[PDB]
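Dissemination and training. As part of the outreach component of the grant, students in the summer workshop were shown how a complex can be specified as a set of sequence lines and then modelled as a single object. The example used during the hands-on session is reproduced here so that future cohorts can follow it. Participants entered these lines:
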Amino acid sequence: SYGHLSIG
Amino acid sequence: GKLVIWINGDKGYNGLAEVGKKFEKDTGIKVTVEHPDKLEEKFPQVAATGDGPDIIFWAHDRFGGYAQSGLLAEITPDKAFQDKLYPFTWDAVRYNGKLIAYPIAVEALSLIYNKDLLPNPPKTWEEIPALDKELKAKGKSALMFNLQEPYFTWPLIAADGGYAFKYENGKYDIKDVGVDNAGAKAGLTFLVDLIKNKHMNADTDYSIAEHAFNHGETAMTINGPWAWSNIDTSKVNYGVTVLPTFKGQPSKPFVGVLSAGINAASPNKELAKEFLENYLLTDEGLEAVNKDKPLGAVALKSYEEELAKDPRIAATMENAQKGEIMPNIPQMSAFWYAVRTAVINAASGRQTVDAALAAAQTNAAAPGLHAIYGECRRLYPDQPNPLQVTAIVKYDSFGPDPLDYVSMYRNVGSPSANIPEHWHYISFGLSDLYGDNRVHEFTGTDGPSGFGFELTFRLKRETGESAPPTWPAELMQGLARYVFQSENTFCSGDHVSWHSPLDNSESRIQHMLLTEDPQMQPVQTPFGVVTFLQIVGVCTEELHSAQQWNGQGILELLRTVPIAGGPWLITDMRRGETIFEIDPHLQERVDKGIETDGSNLSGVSAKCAWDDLPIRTRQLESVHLKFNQESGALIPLCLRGRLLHGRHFTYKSITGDMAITFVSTGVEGAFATEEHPYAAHGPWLQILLTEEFVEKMLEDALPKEYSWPEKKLKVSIVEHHHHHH
Ligand SMILES: OC[C@H]1O[C@H](O[C@H]2[C@H](O)[C@@H](O)[C@@H](O)O[C@@H]2CO)[C@H](O)[C@@H](O)[C@@H]1O
Ligand SMILES: [Zn+2]
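and obtained this result:
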């Protein structure tokens, strides 16, 4: 239900 | 009803079985004596579910733990009964002013020596290397004893001033641990030195040492009373004597009190009380058990008087005298696991003495770590001391790596389930390991421990791979760095765009999804709950599919395809095709999902912002929103995918404290009215959009600029957060 983008 | 009793396998369980038979004769209630392996570990696991034994036998040091967990029924002996036993034995089984077990016997390690091979045993440890030379000349060795249990090496460690917990104010200080002081380092270094110079072997365990001694192959051993029975049988002319001194100081063995506890869940507490008080704890019963395997210096005075004459018991008590009684506090188990590993790694040379004892010192006072380790022990009983990636400088001192340890296990999988063999990575650090606010805010038993989860990863094993690769650890460190920087917790179903091959090879696996670990069960610690989120490598297309639709669906689709995961969702870095290229029809189902239910994505963390054309609550007539391309590509999803369904959508900036919640008409909790669409409580901004405005918006190369009479939107291409304070 949640997104995390380009964390690295 | 019934009586089930658990006692350790090196103890006199047959004599106890005889006592149980007498109880059956007289009372008619059957008594089953069992000696399962690692009973001290299993009991707290099973007792909570109510399938533990009626009685549990062990040294007192565990019982305070059990007692703290409400696993032990309070024992209620009258004064008359209490008079038969020594007060200090009762003291040993006393916890927070309550009696949690019946004391059976005093135990202490002694030096056992072969009189024929060695008529005059050494008074000092320093003598032994020289002695080993003499004995080796004639094909013998000086000393062999169990090196796999810290119980046996502790007397040497403790000799020059090592200690478990500092006894102060009538109480134990959980912050002051004495395993990495000079004396401990000295003792352990000496042990390791004995091993280095080939006077002992690092792998030596109980049965090996016992065999060696009983066959006259080694002149000395270190053991407790229970061992004598087998020696007696060996007809070796042996003596039991005081342990050797080290640096002019006596070996200080931890004195243990063999005790019997009653399961809190047992419906036969009365039967148990009857059996324990009126059958076991008598001269004849205790004599029977002692006949089988010597108990040592029993707690019962009447039998104590009879057995004290024995110089073996006298020696036991001399060593007992020179030692200290074990604490029974709940943390002891953490202490024992910590020291066990250090002794093993130090002896094997896997770690230096200093590194090992520093690690043990830190780890003993670390409940969350101990708790996670517990779950790991449950999952992998076969691998007590797994290879670990350890950060040289810990994050609390601002080492680069927020994960203190990463454990690597070999998981054999299941060939019947057609789940291949793989490496299982488990992280330590995202949760609260220590609870002293060195990294995390201490929140208590309720709520999440640290961020409330740890990362796991399952990597396809190559047949040529002898050991697990370490790069996934760095991958996890990267992930953790993000979590700490952004303050964003991970949940099952979330996705992670990496845009790089995870192993940095030519692999097409450039992205990650997160799901519940298929084996690791969540754990309760004094610092909160820890769940375990497994990482699943995916392709860009699959990520896009997860974004456009939902994580759970894509995950299941990935489960149905074995080479892409299977039931346990293992990651294969050499995988060359997406599931959509492998099974075209599947695509149809994503398209089946999006069309009927839409998107699952409540919100996303990305580069974004908003502004006027900081502090306070404000309503705004005009608004100016800013996105990156990546987050920008989700705007169509934000509108059609969720707003149309009376749902909200939230963009959060990782860089700032900025946030934007898109809202439709018909939502609840919203302060945004149709009359006053745009309002903010600070960096948090809510804008209410009408489906009308949604469709026109939907219908409508950077910077790419969108504009309206009430609002402007651009797409375009400073601050560091540390720890979880
Ligand atoms: O080695 C760790 C272990 O130490 C003690 O265990 C002793 C036990 O007390 C004796 O009865 C005998 O069985 O030797 C054991 C060592 O193998 C502690 O009692 C125990 O809590 C701890 O894990
Ligand atoms: Zn800090």
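The interface with chain B takes residues 1-8 of chain A (CB under 8 Å). Students were then asked to discuss how this feature might be tested experimentally.
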